[PDB]
A paper describes a structure:
In this study, we focused on a hypothetical [name] TA pair pa3269/[name] that encodes a putative toxin [name] containing a GCN5-related N-acetyltransferase (GNAT) domain and a conserved acetyl-CoA-binding motif. This toxin has been hereafter referred to as PacT (Pseudomonas acetyltransferase toxin). The apo-form PacT exhibits a typical GNAT family fold consisting with a central, eight mixed β sheets which besieged by two or three α helices on each side. However, PacT exhibited low homology with GNAT-RHH toxins and the cognate antitoxin PacA bears a HTH (helix-turn-helix)-XRE (xenobiotic response element) motif; thus, [name] was classified as a GNAT-Xre TA system. GNAT–RHH toxins, including E. coli AtaT and ItaT and S. Typhimurium TacT, have previously been reported to inhibit translation by acetylating charged tRNAs. These experimentally verified GNAT–RHH toxins only share 23.1%–25.53% identities with PacT, although all of them exhibit a conserved GNAT-fold and contain a unique motif (T/L-X-L/V/I-X5-G/K-X-G-L/F/W) for acetyl-coenzyme A binding. Taken together, these results confirmed that the PacT belongs to GNAT family and the [name] constitutes a typical type II TA pair. According to the results, PacT directly bound to Fur. Next, we identified the interacting domain by using the truncated form Fur1-83 and found that this N-terminal DNA-binding domain could sufficiently mediate the Fur–PacT interaction. PacT can directly target the N-terminal HTH domain of Fur through protein–protein interactions without acetylation modification, but the binding of PacT obviously decreased the DNA-binding ability of Fur. Under iron starvation, the significantly increased PacT not only leads to overall translation inhibition and subsequent bacterial adaptation but also stimulates the iron uptake process by directly inhibiting the DNA-binding affinity of the negative iron acquisition regulator Fur.
Numbering used by the authors:
A (entry chain A): 7 to 195
B (entry chain C): 10 to 193
The structure:
């Protein structure tokens, strides 16, 4: 019996709050201005993508989050692919407005969600995955301390519809205390 | 995903229906011993769960018949419609078919349907890291190990275990098909 509940996470001006329908126009618009950075995820420029993340939430298959800095929307991320009997999930489907590319915002987001996943939901496993072609995301997930677990062939389509492989990484609950220590050792006080 | 009938001589795979569940549960209870894991074949809700996913477009569970006789079940699940891709698994057969090769011909029929009818680019298979038997059967299919997912499943007694994930791409399918055919 695992049922995910809505969560807001904060640190300073950074707030992760449950995605609602009233956010979709602004997020779609911001994603479109970030079209070229989104070449490795197919969906964030279409309104349907956010409606389907809300549908999955309605069946308790996801907790999609809007990312705000102060008042302004800045992007999205989600917990998803719940394995309720473990419990396990996946974190990803993240994008940020290019004004935040390289400020440690992405790493702070993964930290907040990882901590919530392991410390509060007692996940035994958090999966992270990305396109085989998305080298930047592979390096950021490695620096998280996740371990690559495999490469799934012909497993996703990029923005043009080209077939790509998927790199799959995970953190287990027993290694999380070490991962957590190293992540918080990396944050500016 | 849509209902469908796959056949090969006496072997027939057809969509699972609620009316088959009593006989399948009963037949698995006669094979209780031979089912360490999985958890499922003795539980009617395990079958109804798969029927429910089918109404949501997420699984295609099949009754396995030899002639008119129900001998087991198997399914397609984990659909990725944009690729398209899926997983085949959740197979069990009563012990009269143990070591008879029916398992591999079932996989042959299912893999044919996924690649040659549905034109999938990826068929996934997986098993517990502790299930050495199922690993050897998957190897002999020619499926290539792709990943080891840690803490990815609970075994029948509840303990955490890793999952070995394998796949067959569409380009490997010709050779997989020929090697399956040669072994019949």
């Amino acid at each position: 019996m695992f049922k995910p509940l809505p969560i807001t996470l904060q640190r300073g001006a950074l707030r992760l709050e449950p995605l609602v329908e009233a956010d979709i126009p602004e997020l779609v618009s911001l994603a479109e201005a970030n079209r070229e950075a989104l070449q490795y995820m197919d969906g964030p420029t279409r309104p349907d993508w956010y409606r389907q993340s809300l549908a999955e939430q309605r069946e308790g298959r996801a907790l999609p989050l809007a990312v705000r800095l102060g008042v302004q929307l800045v992007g999205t991320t989600r917990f998803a692919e719940f394995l309720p009997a473990l419990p396990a999930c996946e974190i990803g489907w993240t994008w940020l407005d290019q004004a935040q590319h390289g400020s440690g915002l992405n790493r702070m987001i993964k930290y907040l969600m990882l901590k919530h996943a392991f410390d509060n939901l007692r996940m035994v496993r958090v999966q992270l995955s990305t396109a085989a072609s998305n080298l930047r995301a592979q390096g950021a997930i490695d620096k998280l301390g996740a371990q690559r677990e495999g490469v799934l062939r012909n497993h996703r389509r990029l923005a043009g519809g080209r077939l790509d492989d998927t790199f799959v990484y995970s953190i287990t609950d027993h290694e999380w205390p070490q991962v957590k220590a190293a992540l918080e050792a990396s944050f500016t006080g």
